[PDB]
Structure 1
Amino acid sequence: VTGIYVKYWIYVCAGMFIVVSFLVVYKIVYMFLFLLCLTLFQVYYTLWRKLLRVFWWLVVAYTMLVLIAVSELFSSILIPGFFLLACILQLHYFHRPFMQLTDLELDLAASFSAVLTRIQVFVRRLLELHVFKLVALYTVWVALKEVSVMNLLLVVLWAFALPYPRFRPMASCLSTVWTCIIIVCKMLYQLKIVNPNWFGVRKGYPNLGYIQNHLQILLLLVFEAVVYRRQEHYRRQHGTRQRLDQDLLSCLKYFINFFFYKFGLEICFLMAVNVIGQRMNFMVILHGCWLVAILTRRRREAIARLWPNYCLFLTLFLLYQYLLCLPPALCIDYPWRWAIPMNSALIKWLYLPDFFRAPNSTNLISDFLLLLCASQQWQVFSAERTEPNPIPNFIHCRSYLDMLK
């Protein structure tokens, strides 16, 4: 129980700090700013992971700020005191144990424990290579469901991070910082400047829903960073293409390891077919035209030559489509519509930016899925470091793999 408390205490303290905010303006704003600064420092891994003295100083500063708190809101101070208590507990003995343990410098309980250990290793290996994809997908989804300025920056950053891998660290850092900045939306919500989109504010009714998505995005980024850090720590301490025919377990292991490495072109073409059948717009027509153009090439060598261009303007076309989908507030509008022989149905069929109607900017997630598939194909495309068939007997059907073959 002592070890469990030493482990699951920083997360509890952070959750309490988040719950303290969201509402009074000054105190909530200060607490949110402190939490965002701590999370950004952890993402940079310069203080929470490299200058732990700064982490202790931040904990002490948070405690001092909570104590500097000293009207029908008698129960409101009930929330701060609990927070203070939590901080005190975290500073009592949890800080030193967490810091010391984080640094790297039917009696079937045994079988089940071993099973959890091996499943934990498997989950570590899977998530250390797939957290980035989920993070990018969730940011894309958040951007598309809320079409507005200050969100195009994240969409562009991720649409350029997926194809070229060298952006992935910096982009993530940039994305985190950007999210922190846009987390300032609460300050816009608590303002009194109604006086009665490029503004990038919606004035959320519950003061939490309008920032909940961005809090989730920041949490996902912090989760990816923590997963990478834990993988590095747990790896500091302590393919099967030839075993393909040993047994069916080896075959399925090979598939789990290199499914995309085997059928990535197929996955990309089918994702493109799904996107074209999903959108049914003129963007879909252009996608199909270029797909036919790419398919005209015979072997994998010409497709290899043409692939980087394909990815480049795929990224460009996603950015352009999002830009078109993103304002009615702007006086900009069709002058003839403000006539023209184009009715509203055709304007809703063309991906034209309307200012009273709105194109459904959610099939762009399908196009972004196409983009991530193409980028992953390009990544795995240049990997070239690894009588001809020794096994002609699968016609003879001597093993369980053979009749499947």
Structure 2
Amino acid sequence: VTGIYVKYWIYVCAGMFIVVSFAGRLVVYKIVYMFLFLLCLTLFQVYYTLWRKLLRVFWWLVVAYTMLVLIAVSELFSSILIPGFFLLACILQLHYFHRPFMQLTDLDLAASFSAVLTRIQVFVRRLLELHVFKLVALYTVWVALKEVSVMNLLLVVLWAFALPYPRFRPMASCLSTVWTCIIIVCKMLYQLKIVNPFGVRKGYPNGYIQNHLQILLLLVFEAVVYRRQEHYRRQHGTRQRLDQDLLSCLKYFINFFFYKFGLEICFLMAVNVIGQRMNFMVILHGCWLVAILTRRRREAIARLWPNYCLFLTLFLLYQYLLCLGMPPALCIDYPWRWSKAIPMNSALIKWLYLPDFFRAPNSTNLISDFLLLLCASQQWQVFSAEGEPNPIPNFIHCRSYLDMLKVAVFRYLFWLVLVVVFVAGATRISIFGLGYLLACFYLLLFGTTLLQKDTRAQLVLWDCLILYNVTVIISKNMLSLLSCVFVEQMQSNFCWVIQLFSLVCTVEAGIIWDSICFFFLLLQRRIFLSHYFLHVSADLKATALQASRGFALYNAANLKSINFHRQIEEKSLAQLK
């Protein structure tokens, strides 16, 4: 207990200070002073100016806060109790939990706990991108959803154009913390009962500042993790190691999952956002995806990556700005929505991503675009971060458990892809379904002969098929307009146009079979290039070289059987004679 108190002390003080909220209405003593002190301490910790370099000043400021609280001190039956408890807690933390805390800040379960803690800390530190990603998710899914307005666009923009540029990431994070503190102050200011009628607070439960508090808590947790990693670091290959057992391969993928499949995952996330949003902006996304994908060689992808990333981040910023525009203070309306008889209506203004007060554009899909941005930034980092033919004969045959998986992946997956293509084609009625069915049929008929072909024609035909699939994706995205904007009019005019395509409105979901088909096709395209498949193709060629002997052996067996029967009949007839 003494060690726990000496170690985990400041957290109790922070919790006690935070517990001072919901003190009826807004009182400067209740919030302003305490909230300002907590914000100053948190900002000092984030910037490491005092709370991580002059913690004596931190203790002095804690003592000063306790003195101010004392100077400040059923109406007062319970209100006079929380300040006393907070003062007592601060005095206790300053009595014994101050010097040992500063010093520390400068049974088979034991081994398991040690291993779990070491793995978690190593992951948080080395794979700091994961932490950054969690903080980004908590800073985007809240600002873009809860309070979509000014005073939250600054932090969103800062992080959005900090993620693809890690050189700006550290200071930007600190700036975000400062901005969060400012937002918190605003949330504390607007909660007062002195308003009486951008980004108004309108505090209902006075739970209306939980977003900024959670963002600050996540930032503090990330900073604490980084500081602990630095303290541990100051104190106290894999590819060849792949082919021993399943555990080694699992650990190797845990290490370098993104390094090899980042482009595939980014394409999959682009398809996912395309499916989820389904608008004109998505038409732009699809056009740019085909533009990148047309250049087949990876070096062209390297050349065109920075343009992709910059275009996508500026597109995200434009989307967020377009979400919040023309504040309702000026009662004038947008240059489109008049009382005129212009052909546009509510359906088209919903489809076309435009700001309208009657139907504000959705703000729970920017998350998918931001995830795509994160994938693109990680892949840009990977791009900037730049014998087996002996083993592969030995996985052509079976060993402990890695060989079975290798043969099931590099040999028995070319047919699962065809099965998935057939299922996708036959599970939804359209012209695209017929095209998928015909492609699957042709591939299945000419499977083995295609496998034994050289890599060139194989990649040519595979790229043709995947480009047809992405063309189908973009065509469905295009026709979603006529599927939703002009449902009744087109239905009355023509019902066969609704027959030939899936005209239902989508509004993970939507094009799911198509997405997995795209995934499997891209995976098989990647497989066709690895060395592992080379000697599987060699085995197929060897099987082709055969088939001049099986017929001979069947004939030999037939001759053996017929001659045995003949001999027994001759014995019988000799007996008869």
- TM-score normalised by the chain length of structure 2: 0.65
Q: Is the 8 A contact 1:156 1:319 kept in 2?
A: yes
SS of the residue 2:355 aligns to: coil
Q: Matches of 1:194 and 1:111 in 2, distance apart?
A: 56
Instruction: Return the offset for 1:165.
Output: 0.6
Distance 1:236 1:392, change over 3 A: same
Distance 1:139 1:222, change over 3 A: farther
Partner of 1:98 in structure 2?
101
Instruction: Return the offset for 1:124.
Output: 5.7
Distance 1:370 1:330, change over 3 A: farther
Instruction: Return the offset for 1:187.
Output: 3.6
Instruction: Return the offset for 1:188.
Output: 3.4
Distance 1:123 1:365, change over 3 A: closer
Partner of 1:243 in structure 2?
241
Distance 1:118 1:43, change over 3 A: closer
Instruction: Return the offset for 1:192.
Output: 4.3
Instruction: Return the offset for 1:69.
Output: 1.3
Distance 1:400 1:201, change over 3 A: same
Write out per-residue CA displacement over residues 193-250 of structure 1, whole angstroms, 9 at most, x where no aligned residue. Answer: 5454xx222221211x111111000000011000000000011111401111122111
Q: Is the 8 A contact 1:40 1:177 kept in 2?
A: yes
Instruction: Return the offset for 1:300.
Output: 0.4
Q: Matches of 2:354 and 2:212 in 1, distance apart?
A: 28
Write out per-residue CA displacement over residues 104-153 of structure 1, whole angstroms, 9 at most, x where no aligned residue. Answer: xx976666666666666556655685345434553343333321001110
Write out per-residue CA displacement over residues 13-50 of structure 1, whole angstroms, 9 at most, x where no aligned residue. Answer: 10100111334234311110110011000000110111
User: Which stretch of the first structure deviates more once superposed, 368-377 or 325-334?
Assistant: 325-334
Q: Matches of 1:160 and 1:107 in 2, distance apart?
A: 47
Q: Is the 8 A contact 1:145 1:362 kept in 2?
A: no
Q: Matches of 1:222 and 1:252 in 2, distance apart?
A: 32
Q: Is the 8 A contact 1:247 1:401 kept in 2?
A: yes
Instruction: Return the offset for 1:93.
Output: 1.0
User: Which stretch of the first structure deviates more once superposed, 14-23 or 328-337?
Assistant: 328-337
Q: Is the 8 A contact 1:157 1:175 kept in 2?
A: yes
Q: Matches of 1:55 and 1:232 in 2, distance apart?
A: 21
Distance 1:38 1:265, change over 3 A: same
Distance 1:120 1:161, change over 3 A: closer
Q: Is the 8 A contact 2:143 2:156 kept in 1?
A: no
Instruction: Return the offset for 1:92.
Output: 0.2
Instruction: Return the offset for 1:67.
Output: 1.0
Q: Is the 8 A contact 2:274 2:286 kept in 1?
A: yes
Q: Matches of 2:128 and 2:37 in 1, distance apart?
A: 29
What residue ranges of structure 1 are gaps of 5+ in the alignment? none
Instruction: Return the offset for 1:389.
Output: 5.4
Instruction: Return the offset for 1:341.
Output: 1.8
Q: Matches of 1:398 and 1:336 in 2, distance apart?
A: 69
SS of the residue 1:142 aligns to: coil
SS of the residue 1:75 aligns to: coil
Partner of 2:16 in structure 1?
16
Q: Alpha carbon RMSD of aligned pairs, Å?
A: 2.2
Partner of 2:114 in structure 1?
113
Quick one: higher RCO (CA 8 Å, sep 6+), 1 or 2? 1
Distance 1:67 1:49, change over 3 A: same
User: Which stretch of the first structure deviates more once superposed, 74-83 or 128-137?
Assistant: 128-137
Distance 1:212 1:319, change over 3 A: same
Write out per-residue CA displacement over residues 68-87 of structure 1, whole angstroms, 9 at most, x where no aligned residue. Answer: 11392232110000000000
Q: Is the 8 A contact 2:246 2:402 kept in 1?
A: yes
Q: Matches of 1:292 and 1:388 in 2, distance apart?
A: 35
Distance 1:62 1:362, change over 3 A: same
Q: Is the 8 A contact 1:135 1:221 kept in 2?
A: no
Q: Matches of 2:342 and 2:187 in 1, distance apart?
A: 42
Q: Is the 8 A contact 1:132 1:224 kept in 2?
A: no
Q: Is the 8 A contact 1:161 1:168 kept in 2?
A: yes
Q: Matches of 2:181 and 2:215 in 1, distance apart?
A: 10
Distance 1:234 1:332, change over 3 A: farther
Partner of 1:271 in structure 2?
269
SS of the residue 1:94 aligns to: coil
Distance 1:235 1:279, change over 3 A: same
User: Which stretch of the first structure deviates more once superposed, 115-124 or 27-36?
Assistant: 115-124
Q: Is the 8 A contact 1:128 1:227 kept in 2?
A: no
User: Which stretch of the first structure deviates more once superposed, 294-303 or 143-152?
Assistant: 143-152
What residue ranges of structure 2 are gaps of 5+ in the alignment? 407-577
SS of the residue 2:383 aligns to: coil
Q: Is the 8 A contact 2:125 2:226 kept in 1?
A: no
Distance 1:336 1:363, change over 3 A: closer
Pick the structure with greater CA Rg. 2
Q: Is the 8 A contact 1:268 1:373 kept in 2?
A: yes
Q: Does 1:201 align with 2:200?
A: yes
Distance 1:124 1:157, change over 3 A: closer
Q: Matches of 1:268 and 1:133 in 2, distance apart?
A: 18
SS of the residue 1:20 aligns to: coil
Partner of 1:336 in structure 2?
336
User: Which stretch of the first structure deviates more once superposed, 392-401 or 134-143?
Assistant: 134-143
Instruction: Return the offset for 1:349.
Output: 0.8
Q: Matches of 2:309 and 2:182 in 1, distance apart?
A: 30
Q: Is the 8 A contact 1:144 1:364 kept in 2?
A: no
Instruction: Return the offset for 1:53.
Output: 2.0
Distance 1:258 1:320, change over 3 A: same
Q: Is the 8 A contact 2:160 2:313 kept in 1?
A: yes
User: Which stretch of the first structure deviates more once superposed, 337-346 or 353-362?
Assistant: 337-346
Distance 1:263 1:75, change over 3 A: same
Distance 1:346 1:142, change over 3 A: same
User: Which stretch of the first structure deviates more once superposed, 110-119 or 167-176?
Assistant: 110-119
Distance 1:59 1:45, change over 3 A: same
Instruction: Return the offset for 1:176.
Output: 0.1
Q: Is the 8 A contact 2:187 2:209 kept in 1?
A: yes
User: Which stretch of the first structure deviates more once superposed, 392-401 or 302-311?
Assistant: 392-401
Q: Percentage identity across aligned positions? A: 100
User: Which stretch of the first structure deviates more once superposed, 236-245 or 38-47?
Assistant: 236-245
Distance 1:114 1:141, change over 3 A: closer
Q: Is the 8 A contact 1:17 1:83 kept in 2?
A: yes
Instruction: Return the offset for 1:185.
Output: 2.8
Which of 52, 63, 68 aligns to 1:65? It is 68
Q: Is the 8 A contact 1:47 1:54 kept in 2?
A: yes
Q: Matches of 1:335 and 1:26 in 2, distance apart?
A: 48
Q: Is the 8 A contact 2:265 2:375 kept in 1?
A: yes
Distance 1:151 1:117, change over 3 A: closer
Instruction: Return the offset for 1:366.
Output: 0.4
Instruction: Return the offset for 1:337.
Output: 2.5
Q: Is the 8 A contact 1:324 1:352 kept in 2?
A: yes
